[PDB]
Design an enzyme around this catalytic site. Structure first.
Site, PDB file in Angstrom:
ATOM      1  N   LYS A 113       0.852  -1.189   0.000  1.00 53.96           N
ATOM      2  CA  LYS A 113       0.000   0.000   0.000  1.00 53.96           C
ATOM      3  C   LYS A 113       0.889   1.240   0.000  1.00 53.96           C
ATOM      4  O   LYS A 113       1.769   1.360   0.877  1.00 53.96           O
ATOM      5  CB  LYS A 113      -0.894   0.011   1.273  1.00 53.96           C
ATOM      6  CG  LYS A 113      -1.949   1.142   1.246  1.00 53.96           C
ATOM      7  CD  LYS A 113      -2.534   1.483   2.661  1.00 53.96           C
ATOM      8  CE  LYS A 113      -3.600   2.614   2.595  1.00 53.96           C
ATOM      9  NZ  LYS A 113      -4.281   2.827   3.980  1.00 53.96           N
ATOM     10  N   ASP A 241     -11.436   6.314  11.903  1.00 50.61           N
ATOM     11  CA  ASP A 241     -11.624   6.316  10.448  1.00 50.61           C
ATOM     12  C   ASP A 241     -11.106   5.063   9.771  1.00 50.61           C
ATOM     13  O   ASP A 241     -10.859   5.100   8.574  1.00 50.61           O
ATOM     14  CB  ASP A 241     -10.964   7.537   9.816  1.00 50.61           C
ATOM     15  CG  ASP A 241     -11.697   8.814  10.166  1.00 50.61           C
ATOM     16  OD1 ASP A 241     -11.044   9.799  10.588  1.00 50.61           O
ATOM     17  OD2 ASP A 241     -12.943   8.807  10.058  1.00 50.61           O
TER      18      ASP A 241
HETATM   19  C1  UHJ Z   1      -1.743   0.365   5.971  1.00 52.35           C
HETATM   20  S1  UHJ Z   1      -3.420   0.281   6.629  1.00 52.35           S
HETATM   21  O1  UHJ Z   1      -3.547  -0.655   7.723  1.00 52.35           O
HETATM   22  O2  UHJ Z   1      -3.625   1.502   7.385  1.00 52.35           O
HETATM   23  N1  UHJ Z   1      -4.507   0.148   5.393  1.00 52.35           N
HETATM   24  C2  UHJ Z   1      -4.693  -1.067   4.658  1.00 52.35           C
HETATM   25  C3  UHJ Z   1      -5.574  -0.909   3.614  1.00 52.35           C
HETATM   26  C4  UHJ Z   1      -5.855  -1.961   2.774  1.00 52.35           C
HETATM   27  C5  UHJ Z   1      -5.245  -3.174   3.036  1.00 52.35           C
HETATM   28  C6  UHJ Z   1      -5.661  -4.331   2.154  1.00 52.35           C
HETATM   29  C7  UHJ Z   1      -5.534  -5.612   2.663  1.00 52.35           C
HETATM   30  N2  UHJ Z   1      -5.913  -6.669   1.966  1.00 52.35           N
HETATM   31  C8  UHJ Z   1      -6.449  -6.551   0.765  1.00 52.35           C
HETATM   32  C9  UHJ Z   1      -6.631  -5.302   0.220  1.00 52.35           C
HETATM   33  C10 UHJ Z   1      -7.265  -5.182  -1.159  1.00 52.35           C
HETATM   34  C11 UHJ Z   1      -8.343  -4.438  -1.387  1.00 52.35           C
HETATM   35  S2  UHJ Z   1      -9.081  -3.262  -0.444  1.00 52.35           S
HETATM   36  C12 UHJ Z   1     -10.381  -2.786  -1.397  1.00 52.35           C
HETATM   37  N3  UHJ Z   1     -11.239  -1.925  -1.164  1.00 52.35           N
HETATM   38  N4  UHJ Z   1     -10.402  -3.619  -2.683  1.00 52.35           N
HETATM   39  C13 UHJ Z   1      -9.148  -4.650  -2.710  1.00 52.35           C
HETATM   40  O3  UHJ Z   1      -8.936  -5.411  -3.599  1.00 52.35           O
HETATM   41  C14 UHJ Z   1      -6.240  -4.172   0.934  1.00 52.35           C
HETATM   42  C15 UHJ Z   1      -4.360  -3.350   4.093  1.00 52.35           C
HETATM   43  C16 UHJ Z   1      -4.075  -2.284   4.958  1.00 52.35           C
END
Ligand code: UHJ
Ligand code: UHJ
Lengths: 316, 312
Positions: A113, A241
């Site tokens: 990310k 959030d």
């Molecule tokens: C660094 S953090 O902790 O603050 N934020 C965070 C945000 C997203 C993920 C994450 C984890 N696993 C899969 C996805 C894929 C997605 S998410 C969506 N809306 N559509 C998809 O394909 C995203 C992990 C951490």
């Protein structure tokens, strides 16, 4: 043999840097315990090649790894072997998912990310408490599983990234996705978003489209128990959030030596099978995401958490 | 697991850098042929660790490798496998020889010589012709076999090094050593040098002390033909002030059987003539070739070649 080639120079620097970072840690003893200095540590590398390797790699770049000893220990606590991690991130380029950009490792095990410099500062502010929390739950949590954090510079562009375990399965496809907050204001996918053929739907879409999650009482209790402890942890850190990411795999619709609907719970750690009375055989993948927003950067973190837990409890 | 620890931070950076260099080249395709740009190329890396790996490595260092594609190809032409080379320079620290500093790899296969920036500039000036010469002679030469050239930095110190094959044996001891120029002036080990237990003696010590080298006619013919071609190569490049390094192993004063050596590892060894008054093995090579042009390069070469045939 790997060359780290990519049309996107940032992906080449990421693959090179993860390769470099993991190899370097192979020449650093594994400590009995982390110490305070490990949570403010980093390694920075600046590379300037002239007329060398000039078709595989950018010639001038920088790669910085934050707190390498801590994230190595977190990988171990999450059951991830460093050579496997290195291979998943470098054997073939990560793929883009179409500012809040993400890539998936080629084997779909990990998410990369892109985050802000403020997000990096917040991760440092919580890293000791997060690591101690992961120790106390033995790695069993609905929070994101943080595996590495880097800064990349190439071609006048500087980005920060964080690597987490994929909330979704590395094998079972997800046909419907939701991002849930418990806020009831602007929580509905755009018509632009709903035109993709895997949109991210939001709270009011989950309600209005009649979405149900068919899990038995035993699993629901375990899940909501875990969720409460994880959210209470986030509220104490004054974080808010954040979302519940919900992905749904349709066993009978992916049809058209693991048998259908089966998954390795040590790899797909967020999967929960549906209950026997479900109208379709489904598997759910649910976890908390986007946790890095601090309060003083309306509802406060306490009110946010109670509204979140209340909403998720009501939709099951 | 290797940690590259050393009391000398420059040795830690050398070990780290050779480890890094060879691993990086594993991610670079081997070309069909070298091209001009490869002889002007370099790889530079600057590392700044904060509170990380502080017991093995300096916190701030830089490592620069000159013409990596060229030295990789030279290692292959000299029969040196990159992983072996990497292992020899990193599994345990190089040892100092104890000015003109040398370290020897822990397994005595390779020599690491500290050189000046002027030497580095001369090396780049000759590298194309040197590589072409090594191609033409199939790596069979009495010249130094250059295997890698680096610049090392640790926060207030910058040095340049070149890595060569050891002229001496990786197993057999040297009981006497000489550095020969074909003097015409006076070359003589100092009384300080001459108090160590392995001094580098010079021309007048060789002459004065009655050193004779006993090798058979075929071996002498092969050696002197090679020496002629190598020295004419140096003269064309306007190089001079090089020496013949001569190491002598004493077979039954030092004790694979005795006097026995692998000519594919100790590539400069020559067995003495079977009728020699005593059993010896000789190790001979041209060293110190990086000085660019009274004596001129052609006169230096003829005086040198006359002297060496002269002592056989
Ligand atoms: C660094 S953090 O902790 O603050 N934020 C965070 C945000 C997203 C993920 C994450 C984890 N696993 C899969 C996805 C894929 C997605 S998410 C969506 N809306 N559509 C998809 O394909 C995203 C992990 C951490
Ligand atoms: C870079 S260069 O080509 O211009 N110069 C050069 C000088 C010496 C060697 C070399 C190679 N092999 C063994 C030795 C050990 C010695 S030398 C001495 N006097 N006593 C020792 O133990 C030294 C190689 C190249």
């Amino acid at each position: 043999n790997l060359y780290f080639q990519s049309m996107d120079p940032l992906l080449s620097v990421l693959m090179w840097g993860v390769n470099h970072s993991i190899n370097e840690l192979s020449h650093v003893q594994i400590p009995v315990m982390l110490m305070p200095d490990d949570f403010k540590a980093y390694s920075k590398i600046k590379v300037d090649n002239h007329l060398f390797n000039k078709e595989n790699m950018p010639s001038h770049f920088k790669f910085k790894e934050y707190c390498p000893m801590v994230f190595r220990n977190l990988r171990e606590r999450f059951g991830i072997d460093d050579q496997d991690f290195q291979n998943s991130l470098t054997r073939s380029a990560p793929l883009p998912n179409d500012g809040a950009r993400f890539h998936t490792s080629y084997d779909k095990r990990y998410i990369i990310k892109t985050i802000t410099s403020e997000d990096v500062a917040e991760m440092h502010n919580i890293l000791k408490k997060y690591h101690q929390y992961i120790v106390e739950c033995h790695g069993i949590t609905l929070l994101p599983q943080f595996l590495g954090m880097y800064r990349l510079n190439v071609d006048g562009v500087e980005i920060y990234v964080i690597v987490t375990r994929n909330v979704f399965s590395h094998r079972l496809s997800v046909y419907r996705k939701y991002d849930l907050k418990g806020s009831t204001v602007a929580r509905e996918a755009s018509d632009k978003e709903k035109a993709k053929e895997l949109p991210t739907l939001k709270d009011n879409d989950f309600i209005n489209e009649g979405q149900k999650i068919y899990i038995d009482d035993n699993n629901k209790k375990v899940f909501l128990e875990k969720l409460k402890k994880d959210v209470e942890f986030l509220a104490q850190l004054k974080l808010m959030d954040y979302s519940l990411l919900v992905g749904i795999h349709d066993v009978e619709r992916a049809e058209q030596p693991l048998a259908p609907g089966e998954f390795d719970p040590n790899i797909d750690v967020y999967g929960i099978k549906c209950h026997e009375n479900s109208p379709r055989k489904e598997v759910y993948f649910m976890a908390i995401i986007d946790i890095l927003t601090h309060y003083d950067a309306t509802v406060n973190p306490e009110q946010y958490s109670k509204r979140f837990l209340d909403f998720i409890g009501h939709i099951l």
